[PDB]
Amino acid sequence: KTRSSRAGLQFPVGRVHRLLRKGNYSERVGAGAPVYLAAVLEYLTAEILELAGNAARDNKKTRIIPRHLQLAIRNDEELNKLLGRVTIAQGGVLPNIQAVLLPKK
Amino acid sequence: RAKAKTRSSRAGLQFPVGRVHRLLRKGNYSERVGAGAPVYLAAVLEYLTAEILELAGNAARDNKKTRIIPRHLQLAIRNDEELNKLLGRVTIAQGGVLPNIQAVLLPKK
Amino acid sequence: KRKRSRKESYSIYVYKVLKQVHPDTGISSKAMGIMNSFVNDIFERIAGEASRLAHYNKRSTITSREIQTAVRLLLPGELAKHAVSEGTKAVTKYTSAK
Amino acid sequence: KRKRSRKESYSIYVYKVLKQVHPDTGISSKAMGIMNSFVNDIFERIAGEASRLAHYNKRSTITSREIQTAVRLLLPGELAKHAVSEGTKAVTKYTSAK
Amino acid sequence: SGRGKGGKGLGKGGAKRHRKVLRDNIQGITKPAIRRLARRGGVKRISGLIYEETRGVLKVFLENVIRDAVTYTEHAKRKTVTAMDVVYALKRQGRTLYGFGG
Amino acid sequence: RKVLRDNIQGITKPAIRRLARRGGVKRISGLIYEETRGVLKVFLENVIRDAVTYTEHAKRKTVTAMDVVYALKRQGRTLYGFGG
Amino acid sequence: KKPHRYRPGTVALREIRRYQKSTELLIRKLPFQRLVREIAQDFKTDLRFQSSAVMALQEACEAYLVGLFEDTNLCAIHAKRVTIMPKDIQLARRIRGERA
Amino acid sequence: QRLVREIAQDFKTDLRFQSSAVMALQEACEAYLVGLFEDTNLCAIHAKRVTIMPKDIQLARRIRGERA
Ligand SMILES: [Ca+2]
Ligand SMILES: [Ca+2]
Ligand SMILES: [Ca+2]
Ligand SMILES: [Ca+2]
Ligand SMILES: [Ca+2]
Ligand SMILES: [Cl-]
Ligand SMILES: [Cl-]
Ligand SMILES: [Cl-]
Ligand SMILES: [Cl-]
Ligand SMILES: [K+]
């Protein structure tokens, strides 16, 4: 047994629980709270890695680099919104040229 | 025993050092609160309040009014480079805006 | 009946500061509401930044030092100087008046 | 020697989730650095909102219900639905396991 | 069939607990009122396309603030939206409001 | 020299062109390189002032990546990949 | 002489001075209150509102639109027009990060 | 780097920098400028131009609430 194992989780329920208590959020921390929080961090971490891993596959690369994260996040309407005010070091920007700037055809 | 005087009075302050010390303890900011922190913070809130009331009062005098209203606070704040910055992202209920008309929109004399 | 539940506010302190600054000037109920929002706002900001400063530096205690740094980060130039001046006076006076 | 502090990080758990979703793909150190920034950001957002929820409602305890309300406020529509779903599932499974 | 097994929380399926259950009121944001708001904003001339475009924006502004207000309401187990629910909602949206509490 | 005691000139016209290119900009007024330099400098002033305030508070003589990450967060320009 | 007739723009300027001088709410209160209640139904049925809650919402709404009209106006003038248009508002909301 | 050290001097003398501190500042600046250019370009196109000009940068920063 481990709290993570009992909750079905890769993320560390115990660590998260300690961070809430010591992190000056509340006097007391209920036993569900770090389980719920770890599960959500794990869910969001999984979504990004799934998408970034596909971006890597599509570039014939076995390793995720910051660009694979940037492409995953910026081409996902909801992730892009969650991280609209976040800069990803070495991520670059999505290819995008205003129509009026392209030549006529 | 006693002949007690408030921490406010000892620090030469109008703002409640004791109330400020209790809000820091119960506000979930740190495990412990040093004895200087609420004196300092109470001082800063007093200074800033004095500054807004000085400039609101001038706006109230300027409108031939004895009582400060939301509009006086707004004029005071929006016409002061530094207060406008401190409260750049703050809406003052019943404050309105500053009289400002873009030059290009004025008729040609 | 019951006497209405206690609602703390800063309004006696705002009135006392107003009487130093403009002795012949008063304040509408709404105006005072705005003053109350203001004080609580800047409390939150300074206190929260101070919370972080201690946290970043592995310290359990918010001291007058954390407040001061918080004020330097949060208040514009001239406002920050006065504030730091008034806080430092008030601590110094407090400490010597034990 | 034997300094370098001992600095905690989520990177073993990031790798662990990565091997579930993509068992043959790895991850650069900068990319891991961004994943670690990401977890600390969202942790701080959720916990901060949860801290406020309990404070607004005069409660001493952040429970799974504060986390759940924090998540609804913080995550966009579809992301929030799934995040609530996973958190609810994990709590349910963890209580049923004692 | 519908869609969903458990909708006991929503409370939807509500009528004749006295009159209630609303109309189509966005049109009550009149062209004159929109012109008044644009006047306070220093606007001198207004395309006719502005009025419907503004109602769109006002609606999205209100959906976002109210969704978060009512979230504060539901969390506090209340049936009444308080001013503080709105003030917490607006602070979240980075639209901090003075003079209704906090 | 003037460039060493006005290092802002080391941000070259080519470097500002490359930045505007990444921002999808096609054609550039000659007046933009000076205007960009003014803007860049305000940005760094604001970020470095806050970063160095964290440095002084910690009683250090060395600005760390974290001082910069905390300053960038404060200014609403949260940065991932330097110890978030 | 004719019956008096102000040129197009003059009354507009007058209104600008009038409303920039005052702080009263410029959306009629009851229509706004219905609108609020109507939108709230999409999130939860049979909700009550404190009147100060509905007032807080209206202060926040009008302040937001007056501000967006300031930004919309700048975008019109940037394009050497005096007439605000949907694409003015849209640019203002895009650069504000309110909209993708 | 020289620009960073120069600007730091105005706030405190004899400051050292972690190399990652300077790299984090460069990452942040370039991201900020690239993004300001995206917004500057839109303002240029809004005025039926293809050429970004200082007033484009000024309007972008005014609406962003970076400048009064
Ligand atoms: Ca699973
Ligand atoms: Ca999955
Ligand atoms: Ca998704
Ligand atoms: Ca005086
Ligand atoms: Ca969505
Ligand atoms: Cl202390
Ligand atoms: Cl719990
Ligand atoms: Cl249009
Ligand atoms: Cl120009
Ligand atoms: K806290």
Swiss-Prot record, chain A:
Residues bearing the modification N5-methylglutamine: 90
One of the GO BP terms on file: negative regulation of cell population proliferation
Record-listed N6-(2-hydroxyisobutyryl)lysine modification sites: 22, 60-61, 81, 104
Post-translational modification, as annotated: Monoubiquitination of Lys-105 (H2AK119Ub) by RING1, TRIM37 and RNF2/RING2 complex gives a specific tag for epigenetic transcriptional repression and participates in X chromosome inactivation of female mammals. It is involved in the initiation of both imprinted and random X inactivation. Ubiquitinated H2A is enriched in inactive X chromosome chromatin. Ubiquitination of H2A functions downstream of methylation of 'Lys-27' of histone H3 (H3K27me). H2AK119Ub by RNF2/RING2 can also be induced by ultraviolet and may be involved in DNA repair.
Primary localization: nucleus
Similarity comment text for this entry: Belongs to the histone H2A family.
Entry protein name: Histone H2A type 1-B/E
UniProtKB/Swiss-Prot annotation, chain E:
Positions carrying N-acetylserine: 1
Keyword Phosphoprotein among record annotations: yes
Chain positions with N6-methyllysine modification: 12, 20
SUPFAM superfamilies: Histone-fold (SSF47113)
Post-translational modification: Acetylation at Lys-5 (H4K5ac), Lys-8 (H4K8ac), Lys-12 (H4K12ac) and Lys-16 (H4K16ac) occurs in coding regions of the genome but not in heterochromatin. Acetylated as part of spermatogenesis progression prior to histone-to-protamine exchange.
Disease note: Tessadori-Bicknell-Van Haaften neurodevelopmental syndrome 1: An autosomal dominant disorder with onset in infancy, characterized by poor overall growth, microcephaly, hypotonia, profound global developmental delay, impaired intellectual development, poor or absent speech, and characteristic dysmorphic facial features, including hypertelorism and abnormal nose. Other variable neurologic and systemic features may also occur.
Function: Core component of nucleosome. Nucleosomes wrap and compact DNA into chromatin, limiting DNA accessibility to the cellular machineries which require DNA as a template. Histones thereby play a central role in transcription regulation, DNA repair, DNA replication and chromosomal stability. DNA accessibility is regulated via a complex set of post-translational modifications of histones, also called histone code, and nucleosome remodeling.
This protein's name: Histone H4
Gene: H4C1
Curated annotation (Swiss-Prot), chain F:
PTM sites of type N6,N6-dimethyllysine: 2
Positions of post-translational Phosphothreonine modification: 62
Domain of life of the organism encoding this protein: Eukaryota
Modified-residue entries (N6-(beta-hydroxybutyryl)lysine), positions: 13, 59, 73
Outcome of swapping residue 73 to E: In TEBIVANED2; results in severe early developmental defects when expressed in zebrafish embryos
Modified residues (N6-lactoyllysine): 13, 59, 73
Record PTM N6-acetyllysine, positions in chain: 13, 73
One GO MF term attached to the UniProt entry: structural constituent of chromatin
Any one biological process term the GO annotation gives: nucleosome assembly
UniProt modified residues of type N6-succinyllysine: 13, 59, 61, 73
Sequence positions bearing N6-propionyllysine: 13, 26, 59, 61, 73
Main location: nucleus
Record cross-link Glycyl lysine isopeptide (Lys-Gly) (interchain with G-Cter in ubiquitin), residues: 73
Residues found modified as N6-(2-hydroxyisobutyryl)lysine: 13, 26, 41, 59, 61, 73
Keyword Plastid: no
Residues with N6-butyryllysine modification: 13, 26, 59, 61, 73
Modified residues (Phosphotyrosine): 33, 70
Annotated effect of mutating residue 27 to C: In TEBIVANED3
Residue numbers carrying N6-glutaryllysine: 13, 41, 59, 61, 73
Cross-link Glycyl lysine isopeptide (Lys-Gly) (interchain with G-Cter in SUMO2) placement: 2, 13, 41, 61, 73
Stated consequence of mutating residue 22 to L: In TEBIVANED4; results in early developmental defects when expressed in zebrafish embryos
Keywords: Acetylation, Chromosomal rearrangement, Chromosome, Citrullination, Disease variant, DNA-binding, Hydroxylation, Intellectual disability, Isopeptide bond, Methylation, Nucleosome core, Nucleus, Phosphoprotein, Ubl conjugation
Record-stated family: Belongs to the histone H4 family.
Role: Core component of nucleosome. Nucleosomes wrap and compact DNA into chromatin, limiting DNA accessibility to the cellular machineries which require DNA as a template. Histones thereby play a central role in transcription regulation, DNA repair, DNA replication and chromosomal stability. DNA accessibility is regulated via a complex set of post-translational modifications of histones, also called histone code, and nucleosome remodeling.
Name of the protein described by the UniProt record: Histone H4
Taxonomic lineage from the root: Eukaryota, Metazoa, Chordata, Craniata, Vertebrata
Complete-protein stretch covered: 20 to 103 of 103
Curated annotation (Swiss-Prot), chain G:
UniProt modified residues of type N6-succinyllysine: 21, 44, 87
Part of the full-length chain shown: 37 to 136 of 136
Coiled-coil ranges from the UniProt annotation: none
N6-lactoyllysine sites (modified residues): 21, 44
Keyword annotations of the record: Acetylation, ADP-ribosylation, Chromosome, Citrullination, Disease variant, DNA-binding, Hydroxylation, Lipoprotein, Methylation, Nucleosome core, Nucleus, Phosphoprotein, Ubl conjugation
Residues where N6-methyllysine is found: 1-2, 21, 29, 44, 87
One CC-aspect GO term: protein-containing complex
Modification type N6-acetyllysine: residues: 1, 21, 44, 80, 87
Phenotype for residue 1 to M: Found in pediatric undifferentiated soft tissue sarcoma samples; uncertain significance; somatic mutation; also found in a subset of human papillomavirus-negative head and neck squamous cell carcinomas; uncertain significance; results in global decrease of H3K36me2 and H3K36me3 levels and increased H3K27me3 levels
Post-translational modification: Acetylation is generally linked to gene activation. Acetylation at Lys-87 (H3K122ac) by EP300/p300 plays a central role in chromatin structure: localizes at the surface of the histone octamer and stimulates transcription, possibly by promoting nucleosome instability.
Chief subcellular location: nucleus
GO biological process: chromatin organization; epigenetic regulation of gene expression; gene expression; nucleosome assembly; telomere organization
Species of origin: Homo sapiens
Residues where N6-(beta-hydroxybutyryl)lysine is found: 21, 44, 87
Modified residues (Phosphotyrosine): 6
Residues bearing PTM N6,N6,N6-trimethyllysine: 1, 21, 44
Family recorded in the similarity comment: Belongs to the histone H3 family.
Protein name (record): Histone H3.1
Molecular-function GO terms, alphabetical: cadherin binding; DNA binding; protein heterodimerization activity; structural constituent of chromatin
